[PDB]
Amino acid sequence: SNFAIILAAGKGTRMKSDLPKVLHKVAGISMLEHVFRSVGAIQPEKTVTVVGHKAELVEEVLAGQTEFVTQSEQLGTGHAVMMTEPILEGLSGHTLVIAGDTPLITGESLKNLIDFHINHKNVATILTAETDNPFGYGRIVRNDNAEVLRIVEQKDATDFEKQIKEINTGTYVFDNERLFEALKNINTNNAQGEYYITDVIGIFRETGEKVGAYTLKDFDESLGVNDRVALATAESVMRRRINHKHMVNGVSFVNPEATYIDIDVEIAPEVQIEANVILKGQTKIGAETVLTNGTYVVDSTIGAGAVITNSMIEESSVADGVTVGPYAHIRPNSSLGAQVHIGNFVEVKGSSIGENTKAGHLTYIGNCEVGSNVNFGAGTITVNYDGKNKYKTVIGDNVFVGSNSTIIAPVELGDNSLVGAGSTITKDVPADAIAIGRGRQINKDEYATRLPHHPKNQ
Amino acid sequence: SNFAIILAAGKGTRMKSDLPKVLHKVAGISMLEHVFRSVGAIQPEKTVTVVGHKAELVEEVLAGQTEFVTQSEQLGTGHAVMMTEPILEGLSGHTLVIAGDTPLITGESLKNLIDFHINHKNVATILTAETDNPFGYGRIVRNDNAEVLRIVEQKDATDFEKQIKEINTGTYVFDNERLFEALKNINTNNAQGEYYITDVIGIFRETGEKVGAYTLKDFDESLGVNDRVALATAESVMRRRINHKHMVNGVSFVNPEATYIDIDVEIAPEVQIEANVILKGQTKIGAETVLTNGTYVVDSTIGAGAVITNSMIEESSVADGVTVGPYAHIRPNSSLGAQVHIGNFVEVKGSSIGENTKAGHLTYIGNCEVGSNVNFGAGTITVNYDGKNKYKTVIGDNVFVGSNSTIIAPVELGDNSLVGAGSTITKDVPADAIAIGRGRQINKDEYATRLPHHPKNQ
Amino acid sequence: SNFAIILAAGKGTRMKSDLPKVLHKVAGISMLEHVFRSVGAIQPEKTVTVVGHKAELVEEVLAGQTEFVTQSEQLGTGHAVMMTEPILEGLSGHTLVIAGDTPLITGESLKNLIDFHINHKNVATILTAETDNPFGYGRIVRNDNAEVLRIVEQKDATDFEKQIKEINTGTYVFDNERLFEALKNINTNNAQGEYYITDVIGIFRETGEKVGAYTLKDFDESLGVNDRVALATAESVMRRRINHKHMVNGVSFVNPEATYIDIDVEIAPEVQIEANVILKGQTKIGAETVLTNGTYVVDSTIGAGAVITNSMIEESSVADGVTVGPYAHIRPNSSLGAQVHIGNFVEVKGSSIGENTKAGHLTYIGNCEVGSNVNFGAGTITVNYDGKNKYKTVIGDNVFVGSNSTIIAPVELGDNSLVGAGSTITKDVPADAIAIGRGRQINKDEYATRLPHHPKNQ
Numbered sequence A, B, C: 001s002n003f004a005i006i007l008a009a010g011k012g013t014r015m016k017s018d019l020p021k022v023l024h025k026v027a028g029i030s031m032l033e034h035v036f037r038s039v040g041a042i043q044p045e046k047t048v049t050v051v052g053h054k055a056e057l058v059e060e061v062l063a064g065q066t067e068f069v070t071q072s073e074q075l076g077t078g079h080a081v082m083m084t085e086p087i088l089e090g091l092s093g094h095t096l097v098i099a100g101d102t103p104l105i106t107g108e109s110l111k112n113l114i115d116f117h118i119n120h121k122n123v124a125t126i127l128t129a130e131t132d133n134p135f136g137y138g139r140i141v142r143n144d145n146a147e148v149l150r151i152v153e154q155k156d157a158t159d160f161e162k163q164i165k166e167i168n169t170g171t172y173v174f175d176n177e178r179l180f181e182a183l184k185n186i187n188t189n190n191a192q193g194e195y196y197i198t199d200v201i202g203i204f205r206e207t208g209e210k211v212g213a214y215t216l217k218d219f220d221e222s223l224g225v226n227d228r229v230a231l232a233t234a235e236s237v238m239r240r241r242i243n244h245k246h247m248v249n250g251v252s253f254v255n256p257e258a259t260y261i262d263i264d265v266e267i268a269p270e271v272q273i274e275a276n277v278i279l280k281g282q283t284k285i286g287a288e289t290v291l292t293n294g295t296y297v298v299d300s301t302i303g304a305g306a307v308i309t310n311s312m313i314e315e316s317s318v319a320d321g322v323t324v325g326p327y328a329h330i331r332p333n334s335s336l337g338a339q340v341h342i343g344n345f346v347e348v349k350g351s352s353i354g355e356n357t358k359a360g361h362l363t364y365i366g367n368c369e370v371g372s373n374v375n376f377g378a379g380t381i382t383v384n385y386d387g388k389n390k391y392k393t394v395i396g397d398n399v400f401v402g403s404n405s406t407i408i409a410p411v412e413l414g415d416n417s418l419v420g421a422g423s424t425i426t427k428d429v430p431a432d433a434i435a436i437g438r439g440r441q442i443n444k445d446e447y448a449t450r451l452p453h454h455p456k457n458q
Ligand SMILES: CC(=O)SCCNC(=O)CCNC(=O)[C@H](O)C(C)(C)COP(=O)(O)OP(=O)(O)OC[C@H]1O[C@@H](n2cnc3c(N)ncnc32)[C@H](O)[C@@H]1OP(=O)(O)O
Pocket: A376, A377, A378, A401, A402, A403, A419, A420, A421, A422, A434, A436, A437, A438, A439, A440, B364, B381, B382, B383, B384, B385, B386, B387, B408, B426, C439, C442, C444, C451
């Protein structure tokens, strides 16, 4: 009943990239993927994506729910659609034709397109829009009774026709039956090589079959991306849309025009986001937590009541009430327990940290299983690499790891123990003990008067 | 002679917050507080704020110069004003009626509103504005001679009336006498429960008493905040206004559209601010200092000629010529003396630092009284916590604190002394002495050929 | 044949700066310098800049290709041009008159101005533009046949004339001969002190000599900067222009409206720039490298395939495939070899680092010649200062510098050697050896039950 054809073979030369045009990301996912999301809104019985060069790459990535045909030669949009013939020829119903480079179009607009089509039982329906600078776009010609007669390109347009402000977005709905029919009719009697999807509209004009146009109230929603300038504009519209949705859902933004949140990030209500925060991938933020300017989060989970201050968190888990930063880096596979505190210049990598534990400064915790109520003094380092292998360090509950100490794994610091500040630990420390591995202080009276820094020597 | 009534009881359901709508901040202070600031511009003999739910909270915070009446039930704006009757009934004069959720209105606009009122000796004056999308707003109906006849809501508006572009901002000036009179007249003969402030305009129409409207030249100044989307817009307008004011006052902004400066921050002329800088609360910046992208300052004082590079400064004092950052954190109750230098990855907490002293890297200084011309080598740590209590460290003038040393308080390093790099200091170091607490170096020939990192073993 | 006169003596009082108005920067260089760049587009046989106060300063800086005359008194634009008389009087040809405070005008617009001039063989040509708020600007009066009759200031304009939307940008092309002629004719018979460049247009009106106006299609291109508000606007237009140019050239921007790239930065295609990145001065970025939010680069070279994560790089060289950050600081005169890795909280100053070497954390490397495949454990510090002099450290290939070690220069760590974590190195370490300078660990059973942090004591 409903079928979809997505054109993704284009030659994105103005992109100046080796990556197939439609694979370029917009807020987390590729333009193609956004098109797949709006397309799904019309519940197409079949979905066929036409890819061109590097065809393998596009497929090798998003093998999403969609058939895949290849267009080895650049013979135009008509030929691209013709490549879906083997799969859609014969079937009766409505077929959506959309480009993979117009990611701003919405599922809602696509639904209205079909409804508008089936409604007037048109043979073909053109998704159109209006602008005051239609230069370059095919124009939409209608009769005094406002019926879509045909589409006129800029090069063929009469002076009088250049005045038309309604343009063709390049998105269409065709009755699948007539469509492939008209595609062979143009292909064979073409007296030329390349044919275009708009050539089918020319045929319906020759035969008088009903063709209509649904207009998009927002012209900017029809943007076709051809270069990194339109790319940025796409990014900008999608950003406003994502952020508008969160604000309506109860999230505060100091500046939603400069906050970068990917398409799939989930944010509980009452969260507060300062300007210039970055949320990427599969990220979740719980209720009332606070994200300050600079925070950067990727594929992570943050609980409720947390305060993330200018810090970078990657593939990690952060419980409720956790405070992080400023300038902290939480690396892959880390888990911070409830009320944990990670202060400035602290790095946590592949480590579980129990609740209420704190590492407030200039610290590195890697490959450690850390307990609850632990204390890391400023300067502490967990050494877990010898140039070939990594080793694990186990730290019990309530351990007091003295400042500037060097913990050389594999070792265990038992519960309630303490490592003297400035110590190098090479062996296990039993529970309730203290470990000290540092030289004893020695004073040399008057010796400083004999060194470069002394006032007497400058 | 002049009285003010501020409506702050509203049910901000679209805000999706537990915090009373008007308490949500906009550039440092709550919307209510901005309204109190514009209201003060008309020197009201009395100011009464009507609060609703959580009434205690709004009051418990800004017990600012203003009477407080409570509206326990949601019976409309008319009933809310009726709650101020005990306090304003009888008094003669002009009474301003304003919402606590329209924080962009200015004191200047409010003054022009009253003057326009007293001028034409109107009984009531409507603060209006113009827009091309008046859908939803009450319209302002005037006669062929441009006199305000009445206000018409959207639901009652005739097709012909929907065309009116002048809308009601919900701000008004009433002759206090007639106002409460008309409020009882509607209340009793209401034949309904809730009555609205606009019902009083209906009565003056019935009686023919003169009603006028002062139009705001800037429509965006009338924004009523109902959700976090308008919240963000408020933040955006107020930000442009604050920043415009500083630029006119001689401050350079690389991008004033993305620089966040609270309402009360003071900035001397010739200061240079890069994009994405944050100034909050009671912050002061002296002449010619430079703030680079990322700098974040809260309730602090910075002198003239300073250079703050991507650093966070909180509740502290920073003298003239000080250089901080990149990535430095100056925490509560710190004071940096003239020409002091705090470099990358350095934390200073509750400490006074004398002039020309330097801590250029990976350093923590907490609870210290530090002298002038001191030098902290990279890696230094002042240890001031044992898990229960904090201790103080006193460091004289010209001390050279060697890199990677660990200073365990409570201790004193006397003038011109030096602590050997990599030392753990547990006792006082007399003036002019040197202290060393580190193991002596030992070399083991060929031993490395026997370890994982060696080329021979990989 | 073509001559240029740049007016740079103005009294930029609304700037509130001690620095001559035209010296204020816009995207890396001064407004004056941007004007010199557009001016060069018309290949002027001679270029003369009129400077006023602090005349020495403007010259003492950009002694660029241009004659320099001084205007000691503020007698108007006419007098300023009159100061170029000694140098341009007599010569025949077209003379461009432009202000040093209109930096957005383009060389292309300037070329079109001259062509439009020489074309109609006009005596004088006025560079004009159109806007809907011409209040304050001199208006352009034309006859029913659209010929430039004269310029009318706002104060003299008739009501009917205030309607004119075409305004004078203050940029002109005059036939050098008549120009100085008309300048003496006004100067002597002036019956007043100060004369203005627009007075020459008045004379051509008296004599009927042909005067024309070339209109700028973009009004915003004519901005005259007088205060830091227009300054910011200039910065904003120039930023969009620079960034538009890179996007067209194949560079991706997450938000080109909030990315700050100086006028002279070079960026290879396929580079990806996140929002809020800063590129200043002579900076070069190679193909496909990635710059994340916060990165700040000044006068540096970055190769291809690099990933710079929220880090600051100054006057340094960075090879291909290098990864830096987050929160790393690469200081002046550093060179990172191919595939080098500098992680979080690491500082590199005046040091060469060989390929594949890594310093992933909390590390300071200053004044070192470091080899290839070296490894710096977290916490390492190279000590190179004694309060008076700096010393160099030489580190061979494949050295393993243990965590928390303190390397006191001048020393050498030979190839494949290893420094034990937590060691203080005061002497050379031969190749293939290991060096250890740390106290041995000692455990005291039960001692912790006797300290403040222990659960038993709280
Ligand atoms: C900067 C921040 O983040 S702040 C929070 C971090 N806080 C910290 O890191 C503080 C940690 N505190 C320390 O390291 C302290 O120096 C402590 C807790 C080890 C001092 O403990 P004390 O028991 O009071 O010191 P004391 O000198 O008596 O030493 C205890 C035992 O160890 C021995 N000892 C002391 N120093 C050494 C040493 N360098 N080598 C070997 N043994 C030593 C003593 O001989 C004594 O043993 P004994 O009883 O058999 O004679």
